[PDB]
Nucleic acid binder design. Structure first.
Ligand SMILES: [Mg+2]
Ligand SMILES: [Mg+2]
Ligand SMILES: [Mg+2]
Ligand SMILES: [Mg+2]
Ligand SMILES: [Mg+2]
Ligand SMILES: [Mg+2]
Ligand SMILES: [Mg+2]
Ligand SMILES: [Mg+2]
Ligand SMILES: [Mg+2]
Ligand SMILES: [Mg+2]
Ligand SMILES: [Mg+2]
Ligand SMILES: [Mg+2]
Ligand SMILES: [Mg+2]
Ligand SMILES: [Mg+2]
Ligand SMILES: [Mg+2]
Ligand SMILES: [Mg+2]
Ligand SMILES: [Mg+2]
Ligand SMILES: [Mg+2]
Ligand SMILES: [Mg+2]
Ligand SMILES: [Mg+2]
Ligand SMILES: [Mg+2]
Ligand SMILES: [Mg+2]
Ligand SMILES: [Mg+2]
Ligand SMILES: [Mg+2]
Ligand SMILES: [Mg+2]
Ligand SMILES: [Mg+2]
Ligand SMILES: [Mg+2]
Ligand SMILES: [Mg+2]
Ligand SMILES: [Mg+2]
Ligand SMILES: [Mg+2]
Ligand SMILES: [Mg+2]
Ligand SMILES: [Mg+2]
Ligand SMILES: [Mg+2]
Ligand SMILES: [Mg+2]
Ligand SMILES: [Mg+2]
Ligand SMILES: [Mg+2]
Ligand SMILES: [Mg+2]
Ligand SMILES: [Mg+2]
Ligand SMILES: [Mg+2]
Ligand SMILES: [Mg+2]
Ligand SMILES: [Mg+2]
Ligand SMILES: [Mg+2]
Ligand SMILES: [Mg+2]
Ligand SMILES: [Mg+2]
Ligand SMILES: [Mg+2]
Ligand SMILES: [Mg+2]
Ligand SMILES: [Mg+2]
Ligand SMILES: [Mg+2]
Ligand SMILES: [Mg+2]
Ligand SMILES: [Mg+2]
Ligand SMILES: [Mg+2]
Ligand SMILES: [Mg+2]
Ligand SMILES: [Mg+2]
Ligand SMILES: [Mg+2]
Ligand SMILES: [Mg+2]
Ligand SMILES: [Mg+2]
Ligand SMILES: [Mg+2]
Ligand SMILES: [Mg+2]
Ligand SMILES: [Mg+2]
Ligand SMILES: [Mg+2]
Ligand SMILES: [Mg+2]
Ligand SMILES: [Mg+2]
Ligand SMILES: [Mg+2]
Ligand SMILES: [Mg+2]
Ligand SMILES: [Mg+2]
Ligand SMILES: [Mg+2]
Ligand SMILES: [Mg+2]
Ligand SMILES: [Mg+2]
Ligand SMILES: [Mg+2]
Ligand SMILES: [Mg+2]
Ligand SMILES: [Mg+2]
Ligand SMILES: [Mg+2]
Ligand SMILES: [Mg+2]
Ligand SMILES: [Mg+2]
Ligand SMILES: [Mg+2]
Ligand SMILES: [Mg+2]
Ligand SMILES: [Mg+2]
Ligand SMILES: [Mg+2]
Ligand SMILES: [Mg+2]
Ligand SMILES: [Mg+2]
Ligand SMILES: [Mg+2]
Ligand SMILES: [Mg+2]
Ligand SMILES: [Mg+2]
Ligand SMILES: [Mg+2]
Ligand SMILES: [Mg+2]
Ligand SMILES: [Mg+2]
Ligand SMILES: [Mg+2]
Ligand SMILES: [Mg+2]
Ligand SMILES: [Mg+2]
Ligand SMILES: [Mg+2]
Ligand SMILES: [Mg+2]
Ligand SMILES: [Mg+2]
Ligand SMILES: [Mg+2]
Ligand SMILES: [Mg+2]
Ligand SMILES: [Mg+2]
Ligand SMILES: [Mg+2]
Ligand SMILES: [Mg+2]
Ligand SMILES: [Mg+2]
Ligand SMILES: [Mg+2]
Ligand SMILES: [Mg+2]
Ligand SMILES: [Mg+2]
Ligand SMILES: [Mg+2]
Ligand SMILES: [Mg+2]
Ligand SMILES: [Mg+2]
Ligand SMILES: [Mg+2]
Ligand SMILES: [Mg+2]
Ligand SMILES: [Mg+2]
Ligand SMILES: [Mg+2]
Ligand SMILES: [Mg+2]
Ligand SMILES: [Mg+2]
Ligand SMILES: [Mg+2]
Ligand SMILES: [Mg+2]
Ligand SMILES: [Mg+2]
Ligand SMILES: [Mg+2]
Ligand SMILES: [Mg+2]
Ligand SMILES: [Mg+2]
Ligand SMILES: [Mg+2]
Ligand SMILES: [Mg+2]
Ligand SMILES: [Mg+2]
Ligand SMILES: [Mg+2]
Ligand SMILES: [Mg+2]
Ligand SMILES: [Mg+2]
Ligand SMILES: [Mg+2]
Ligand SMILES: [Mg+2]
Ligand SMILES: [Mg+2]
Ligand SMILES: [Mg+2]
Ligand SMILES: [Mg+2]
Ligand SMILES: [Mg+2]
Ligand SMILES: [Mg+2]
Ligand SMILES: [Mg+2]
Ligand SMILES: [Mg+2]
Ligand SMILES: [Mg+2]
Ligand SMILES: [Mg+2]
Ligand SMILES: [Mg+2]
Ligand SMILES: [Mg+2]
Ligand SMILES: [Mg+2]
Ligand SMILES: [Mg+2]
Ligand SMILES: [Mg+2]
Ligand SMILES: [Mg+2]
Ligand SMILES: [Mg+2]
Ligand SMILES: [Mg+2]
Ligand SMILES: [Mg+2]
Ligand SMILES: [Mg+2]
Ligand SMILES: [Mg+2]
Ligand SMILES: [Mg+2]
Ligand SMILES: [Mg+2]
Ligand SMILES: [Mg+2]
Ligand SMILES: [Mg+2]
Ligand SMILES: [Mg+2]
Ligand SMILES: [Mg+2]
Ligand SMILES: [Mg+2]
Ligand SMILES: [Mg+2]
Ligand SMILES: [Mg+2]
Ligand SMILES: [Mg+2]
Ligand SMILES: [Mg+2]
Ligand SMILES: [Mg+2]
Ligand SMILES: [Mg+2]
Ligand SMILES: [Mg+2]
Ligand SMILES: [Mg+2]
Ligand SMILES: [Mg+2]
Ligand SMILES: [Mg+2]
Ligand SMILES: [Mg+2]
Ligand SMILES: [Mg+2]
Ligand SMILES: [Mg+2]
Ligand SMILES: [Mg+2]
Ligand SMILES: [Mg+2]
Ligand SMILES: [Mg+2]
Ligand SMILES: [Mg+2]
Ligand SMILES: [Mg+2]
Ligand SMILES: [Mg+2]
Ligand SMILES: [Mg+2]
Ligand SMILES: [Mg+2]
Ligand SMILES: [Mg+2]
Ligand SMILES: [Mg+2]
Ligand SMILES: [Mg+2]
Ligand SMILES: [Mg+2]
Ligand SMILES: [Mg+2]
Ligand SMILES: [Mg+2]
Ligand SMILES: [Mg+2]
Ligand SMILES: [Mg+2]
Ligand SMILES: [Mg+2]
Ligand SMILES: [Mg+2]
Ligand SMILES: [Mg+2]
Ligand SMILES: [Mg+2]
Ligand SMILES: [Mg+2]
Ligand SMILES: [Mg+2]
Ligand SMILES: [Mg+2]
Ligand SMILES: [Mg+2]
Ligand SMILES: [Mg+2]
Ligand SMILES: [Mg+2]
Ligand SMILES: [Mg+2]
Ligand SMILES: [Mg+2]
Ligand SMILES: [Mg+2]
Ligand SMILES: [Mg+2]
Ligand SMILES: [Mg+2]
Ligand SMILES: [Mg+2]
Ligand SMILES: [Mg+2]
Ligand SMILES: [Mg+2]
Ligand SMILES: [Mg+2]
Ligand SMILES: [Mg+2]
Ligand SMILES: [Mg+2]
Ligand SMILES: [Mg+2]
Ligand SMILES: [Mg+2]
Ligand SMILES: [Mg+2]
Ligand SMILES: [Mg+2]
Ligand SMILES: [Mg+2]
Ligand SMILES: [Mg+2]
Ligand SMILES: [Mg+2]
Ligand SMILES: [Mg+2]
Ligand SMILES: [Mg+2]
Ligand SMILES: [Mg+2]
Ligand SMILES: [Mg+2]
Ligand SMILES: [Mg+2]
Ligand SMILES: [Mg+2]
Ligand SMILES: [Mg+2]
Ligand SMILES: [Mg+2]
Ligand SMILES: [Mg+2]
Ligand SMILES: [Mg+2]
Ligand SMILES: [Mg+2]
Ligand SMILES: [Mg+2]
Ligand SMILES: [Mg+2]
Ligand SMILES: [Mg+2]
Ligand SMILES: [Mg+2]
Ligand SMILES: [Mg+2]
Ligand SMILES: [Mg+2]
Ligand SMILES: [Mg+2]
Ligand SMILES: [Mg+2]
Ligand SMILES: [Zn+2]
Lengths: 118, 59, 112, 116, 48
RNA sequence: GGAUGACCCCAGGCGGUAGGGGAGCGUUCCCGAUGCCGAUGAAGGCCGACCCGCGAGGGCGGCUGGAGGUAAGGGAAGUGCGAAUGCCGGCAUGAGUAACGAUAAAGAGGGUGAGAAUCCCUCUCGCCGUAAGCCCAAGGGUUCCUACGCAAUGGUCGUCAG
RNA sequence: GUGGAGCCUGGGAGUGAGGGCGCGAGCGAUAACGUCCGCGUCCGAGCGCGGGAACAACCGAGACCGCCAGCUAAGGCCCCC
RNA sequence: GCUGGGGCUAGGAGUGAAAAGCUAACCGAGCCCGGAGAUAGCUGGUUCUCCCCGAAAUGACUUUAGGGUCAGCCUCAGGCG
RNA sequence: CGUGAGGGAAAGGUGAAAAGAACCCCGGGAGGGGAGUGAAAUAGAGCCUGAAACCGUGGGCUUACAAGCAGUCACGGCCCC
RNA sequence: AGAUGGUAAGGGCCCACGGUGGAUGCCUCGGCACCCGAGCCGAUGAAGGACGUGGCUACCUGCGAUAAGCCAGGGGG
């Protein structure tokens, strides 16, 4: 059973799934838009939203928090200095997901884009 | 186990009765309100790049 | 008047392509095109080509009008099979049949 | 000289398979299963050729019996009556009379009641 | 596990080789036989 | 009965395994044949609700086929298949099922191309590290390097590759 | 008593695991779908046909073919029938 | 003690700290070819059609008993009547 | 295939003549559609004939309250001549 | 209240046409049998092979560093 359990497993063990979200986070904050499978995409939203929210705090503690997932000082500088300010007045929802219309040839996986909001 | 096995060959009738559920359902499609091309709903239109009124994507 | 295309010796198993062909039999050329485009199946790529070649033939050789073409008949016949060895346990050897399809698409004109 | 099968066996099998047209599944497509079916078929025909004679007399008798009781007497009484009367019209025609020409059937019934 | 065939050029040549066959009455008969059959190889071919 | 095998009439028999006997059909081949049928279509193939025969069969007709076939009467045999867990081949069923070969593990961006989860590049992640790195000897034998390819081989894909 | 009677001389066999039932015994336990002989019968080979619900051998009866005709056998005649 | 390379010993023979173990994935006697189409009183299988007839599963003997020889019972031909 | 002695296959046919299909069209190719050749191209090279199992497309009749070695006999409905 | 029809997800029988497959008929560059002819080769290095050999040459055939061939007689046109 699965009654009221939150969080996909995505056929990865605990530490892999973690790495999965972190690496997608790096890619998303870097390029502003990535393409993935729909499930990875919906699952990416929250993980990254939290990171943006902390960069809106701006303080040392929050930077050191974000660094635990993002690990890259420069990318975090980009997060704090360029990205986060765009969201000063925005109350959550800093990411969107829209499904592409074509499936992967080799396995038929449904794709979606995940991008940062304006 | 002790290796179960078909006792009798399946008749042309029975094998085809099994397949009475195997027909594909056609893809569900809707016109893109911009370029009028046919595409699945709730997907960014892959011909013009529009969704929810706006241009989202380079086609 | 009718126009036909055949794809012979397509390296796909007939039972699988036939599923796709079944989707477009009796449909307008236009609807058939849309259907095939969003049919998540390997078979869809092969059927589409036979469709499109027959459409070409129609317009180009048989004085038929694109905007009136429809899929009048379509069918998948079995071609010669490619037998391959599949090694099993305990020294036994099986024989996989990598199967083959002959795909036909026949277009007529839905008049008026 | 060598005398290989050649043309002969195929011809013999087609014979049988043609006879088995209409039969279900392999019974019309497989020589062996057809051949078995025709054996059964052959005896049934013979047997039922026989039983058709029984089957119809049964129907006639049932039908005559119904038409008899309409005039207040049963089949056994009717037939005995006709025997005493010397009337030798068989049940095929009796049954026909009973339905198609009831006035005449009424007459035969009278003769039957009287002959005793 | 260790299987029965363990290639060895020296072993092969010394055991089934042409010179070995000629040495012995039976081996010469082997050659005679294979020649009469028309074998393309009287002897296992091996490279050195 | 009449001349004897013409046909007719009267009567009686006619379930059948092991098995005895009798009469026939068809297949291959030889005489018949320096003949005859045959492109106005041989053999074989596919139909047939038609004709003859108890039957095995034989005709005839239409379609196919494209170069052979052979009569009356006789002769001679590798002469008739449904079974032998028969033999050879072909194609089914199980079935769109089990599986796709270590649970070290993946994600994204860029490029190429008709086509990319699978090829190249970059970044991120993970695995070995007395090895899953390196160097010899066996054995293998061009598998090495480069260009051009993707039908097959590759357990998927392939633009890549032993 | 003229019968798919009988006898004689030859050619060809197959069979040489029988079985149920009735009657007469032995063995067995006045058991066995038991076993072993005798007389007969059927099945075997009549798992063709009617009856016995169904059922080789119980009752009826020996199926050359055809008939949408008639008479019976055993068994039946309230409905299935 | 384990291991590489080079050698030697084999079919009624080798080798075996002995299990009839091992001697090229089946060893109370290896494999290949030959004798060879061994022999198999056993099991299986035996191919068109019609017509007539039509058994036996018993006796005797049998290293015989699920095989046989003779007799019995079937069939065909000639003869007797 | 086997270390080896040794074992040991499968696999023939366009047409009289290559006249073996220029060129165009869809396609990455394969493949096909026209044009052309030929007496014939369902003789087009995966080539004489092209049976059967097997797979499919179209049509007629039929089937979702019914019990089966799949037939057979009767009757009725529908479709065809 | 009563009664009887059109449904086919799919199945079955029949018909037409295809696919697959490679039987059948025809065919024969090959076999088989008998009969006749003929019958040894080799240190002057056989039988049998290895490796080579062509302007471009995988294999076969031929040939041998004079290598699909060199010399001479005969045949043939
Ligand atoms: Mg759980
Ligand atoms: Mg919840
Ligand atoms: Mg959940
Ligand atoms: Mg989680
Ligand atoms: Mg979920
Ligand atoms: Mg995944
Ligand atoms: Mg899992
Ligand atoms: Mg994973
Ligand atoms: Mg961990
Ligand atoms: Mg970019
Ligand atoms: Mg939260
Ligand atoms: Mg952590
Ligand atoms: Mg980290
Ligand atoms: Mg999607
Ligand atoms: Mg979709
Ligand atoms: Mg798609
Ligand atoms: Mg794939
Ligand atoms: Mg277990
Ligand atoms: Mg079955
Ligand atoms: Mg089955
Ligand atoms: Mg079957
Ligand atoms: Mg089944
Ligand atoms: Mg079907
Ligand atoms: Mg089923
Ligand atoms: Mg829109
Ligand atoms: Mg499919
Ligand atoms: Mg289907
Ligand atoms: Mg789909
Ligand atoms: Mg077009
Ligand atoms: Mg395995
Ligand atoms: Mg193995
Ligand atoms: Mg199989
Ligand atoms: Mg297979
Ligand atoms: Mg196939
Ligand atoms: Mg011959
Ligand atoms: Mg024959
Ligand atoms: Mg034969
Ligand atoms: Mg039939
Ligand atoms: Mg029928
Ligand atoms: Mg059947
Ligand atoms: Mg069939
Ligand atoms: Mg019969
Ligand atoms: Mg009758
Ligand atoms: Mg009658
Ligand atoms: Mg009667
Ligand atoms: Mg009736
Ligand atoms: Mg009364
Ligand atoms: Mg009376
Ligand atoms: Mg009467
Ligand atoms: Mg009336
Ligand atoms: Mg180990
Ligand atoms: Mg090894
Ligand atoms: Mg070891
Ligand atoms: Mg080997
Ligand atoms: Mg091996
Ligand atoms: Mg070794
Ligand atoms: Mg070693
Ligand atoms: Mg060595
Ligand atoms: Mg050595
Ligand atoms: Mg040697
Ligand atoms: Mg010797
Ligand atoms: Mg030797
Ligand atoms: Mg050679
Ligand atoms: Mg040797
Ligand atoms: Mg050598
Ligand atoms: Mg060496
Ligand atoms: Mg008579
Ligand atoms: Mg008689
Ligand atoms: Mg009689
Ligand atoms: Mg008889
Ligand atoms: Mg006789
Ligand atoms: Mg004749
Ligand atoms: Mg014959
Ligand atoms: Mg002649
Ligand atoms: Mg002639
Ligand atoms: Mg003439
Ligand atoms: Mg002509
Ligand atoms: Mg003709
Ligand atoms: Mg012939
Ligand atoms: Mg003939
Ligand atoms: Mg005929
Ligand atoms: Mg004809
Ligand atoms: Mg013609
Ligand atoms: Mg003909
Ligand atoms: Mg000629
Ligand atoms: Mg003569
Ligand atoms: Mg003979
Ligand atoms: Mg024979
Ligand atoms: Mg038989
Ligand atoms: Mg067989
Ligand atoms: Mg079997
Ligand atoms: Mg079996
Ligand atoms: Mg079995
Ligand atoms: Mg056998
Ligand atoms: Mg087989
Ligand atoms: Mg299958
Ligand atoms: Mg499934
Ligand atoms: Mg299953
Ligand atoms: Mg499952
Ligand atoms: Mg596996
Ligand atoms: Mg699975
Ligand atoms: Mg693997
Ligand atoms: Mg495997
Ligand atoms: Mg795996
Ligand atoms: Mg895994
Ligand atoms: Mg780990
Ligand atoms: Mg995975
Ligand atoms: Mg990529
Ligand atoms: Mg990309
Ligand atoms: Mg470019
Ligand atoms: Mg591009
Ligand atoms: Mg790829
Ligand atoms: Mg690809
Ligand atoms: Mg992978
Ligand atoms: Mg590590
Ligand atoms: Mg270390
Ligand atoms: Mg370590
Ligand atoms: Mg080396
Ligand atoms: Mg190798
Ligand atoms: Mg290579
Ligand atoms: Mg490839
Ligand atoms: Mg490929
Ligand atoms: Mg490909
Ligand atoms: Mg190529
Ligand atoms: Mg592949
Ligand atoms: Mg593999
Ligand atoms: Mg490429
Ligand atoms: Mg490359
Ligand atoms: Mg390499
Ligand atoms: Mg008698
Ligand atoms: Mg007598
Ligand atoms: Mg007499
Ligand atoms: Mg005899
Ligand atoms: Mg006997
Ligand atoms: Mg005895
Ligand atoms: Mg006994
Ligand atoms: Mg006895
Ligand atoms: Mg008796
Ligand atoms: Mg007795
Ligand atoms: Mg006894
Ligand atoms: Mg009494
Ligand atoms: Mg007593
Ligand atoms: Mg008893
Ligand atoms: Mg008793
Ligand atoms: Mg007693
Ligand atoms: Mg007695
Ligand atoms: Mg008795
Ligand atoms: Mg018996
Ligand atoms: Mg009897
Ligand atoms: Mg009797
Ligand atoms: Mg019974
Ligand atoms: Mg009885
Ligand atoms: Mg009875
Ligand atoms: Mg009864
Ligand atoms: Mg009984
Ligand atoms: Mg009688
Ligand atoms: Mg009466
Ligand atoms: Mg009574
Ligand atoms: Mg009654
Ligand atoms: Mg040492
Ligand atoms: Mg050592
Ligand atoms: Mg060693
Ligand atoms: Mg050594
Ligand atoms: Mg020995
Ligand atoms: Mg020895
Ligand atoms: Mg020996
Ligand atoms: Mg010893
Ligand atoms: Mg020891
Ligand atoms: Mg060995
Ligand atoms: Mg061993
Ligand atoms: Mg021994
Ligand atoms: Mg051994
Ligand atoms: Mg020998
Ligand atoms: Mg001997
Ligand atoms: Mg031997
Ligand atoms: Mg012996
Ligand atoms: Mg023997
Ligand atoms: Mg009799
Ligand atoms: Mg006895
Ligand atoms: Mg006795
Ligand atoms: Mg004695
Ligand atoms: Mg005994
Ligand atoms: Mg015995
Ligand atoms: Mg015995
Ligand atoms: Mg005797
Ligand atoms: Mg007598
Ligand atoms: Mg006698
Ligand atoms: Mg006599
Ligand atoms: Mg080898
Ligand atoms: Mg051929
Ligand atoms: Mg020719
Ligand atoms: Mg030719
Ligand atoms: Mg072109
Ligand atoms: Mg192109
Ligand atoms: Mg183009
Ligand atoms: Mg390409
Ligand atoms: Mg082309
Ligand atoms: Mg073309
Ligand atoms: Mg022309
Ligand atoms: Mg002509
Ligand atoms: Mg064409
Ligand atoms: Mg034709
Ligand atoms: Mg032709
Ligand atoms: Mg073919
Ligand atoms: Mg020809
Ligand atoms: Mg053909
Ligand atoms: Mg064909
Ligand atoms: Mg069919
Ligand atoms: Mg249908
Ligand atoms: Mg009910
Ligand atoms: Mg109903
Ligand atoms: Mg029913
Ligand atoms: Mg029943
Ligand atoms: Mg019925
Ligand atoms: Mg209704
Ligand atoms: Mg209906
Ligand atoms: Mg239906
Ligand atoms: Mg349907
Ligand atoms: Mg066909
Ligand atoms: Mg066919
Ligand atoms: Mg001939
Ligand atoms: Mg000759
Ligand atoms: Mg000397
Ligand atoms: Mg020489
Ligand atoms: Mg050479
Ligand atoms: Mg010269
Ligand atoms: Mg000269
Ligand atoms: Zn659009």
């Amino acid at each position: 059973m699965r009654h009221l359990k939150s969080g996909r497993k995505l056929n990865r063990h605990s530490s892999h799934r973690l790495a999965l979200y972190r690496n997608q986070a790096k890619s998303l904050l870097t390029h502003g838009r990535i393409t993935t499978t729909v499930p990875k995409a919906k699952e990416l939203r929250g993980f990254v939203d939290h990171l943006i929210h902390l960069a809106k705090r701006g303080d040392l503690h929050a930077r050191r928090l974000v660094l635990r997932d993002l690990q890259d000082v420069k990318l975090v500088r980009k997060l704090f200095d360029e990205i986060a300010p765009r969201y000063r007045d925005r109350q959550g929802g800093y990411t969107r997901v829209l499904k592409l219309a074509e499936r992967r040839r080799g396995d038929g996986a449904p794709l979606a884009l995940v991008e940062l909001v304006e | 186990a002790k290796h179960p096995v078909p006792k009798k060959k399946t008749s042309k009738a029975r094998r085809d009765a099994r397949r009475s559920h195997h027909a594909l359902t056609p893809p569900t499609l809707v016109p893109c309100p911009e370029c009028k091309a046919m595409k699945p709903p709730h997907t960014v239109c892959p011909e013009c790049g529009y969704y929810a009124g706006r241009k989202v994507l380079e086609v | 008047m009718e126009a036909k295309a055949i794809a012979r010796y397509v390296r796909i198993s007939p039972r699988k392509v036939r599923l796709v062909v079944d989707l477009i039999r009796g449909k307008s050329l236009e609807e058939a095109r849309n259907i095939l485009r969003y049919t998540n199946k390997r078979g869809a790529y092969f059927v589409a080509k036979v469709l499109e070649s027959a459409a070409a033939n129609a317009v180009n050789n048989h004085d038929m009008l694109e905007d009136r073409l429809y899929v009048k008949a379509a069918y998948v016949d079995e071609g010669p099979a490619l037998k391959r060895v599949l090694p099993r346990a305990r020294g036994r050897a099986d024989i996989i049949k990598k199967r083959t399809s002959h795909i036909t698409v026949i277009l007529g004109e839905k008049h008026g | 000289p060598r005398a290989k099968t050649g043309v002969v066996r195929r011809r013999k099998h087609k014979k049988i398979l043609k006879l088995a047209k209409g039969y279900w599944g392999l019974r019309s497509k497989s020589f062996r299963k057809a051949r078995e079916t025709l054996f059964a078929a052959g005896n049934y025909a013979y047997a039922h050729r026989k039983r058709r004679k029984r089957d119809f007399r049964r129907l006639w008798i049932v039908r005559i019996n119904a038409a008899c009781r309409q005039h207040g007497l049963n089949y056994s009484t009717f037939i005995h009556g006709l025997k005493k009367a010397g009337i030798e019209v068989d049940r095929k025609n009796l049954a026909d009379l009973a339905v198609r020409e009831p006035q005449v059937f009424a007459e035969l019934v009278e003769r039957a009641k009287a002959a005793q | 596990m260790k299987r029965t065939w363990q290639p060895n050029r020296r072993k092969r040549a010394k055991t089934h080789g042409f010179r070995a066959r000629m040495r012995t009455p039976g081996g010469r008969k082997v050659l005679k036989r294979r020649r009469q059959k028309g074998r393309w190889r009287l002897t296992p071919a091996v490279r050195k």
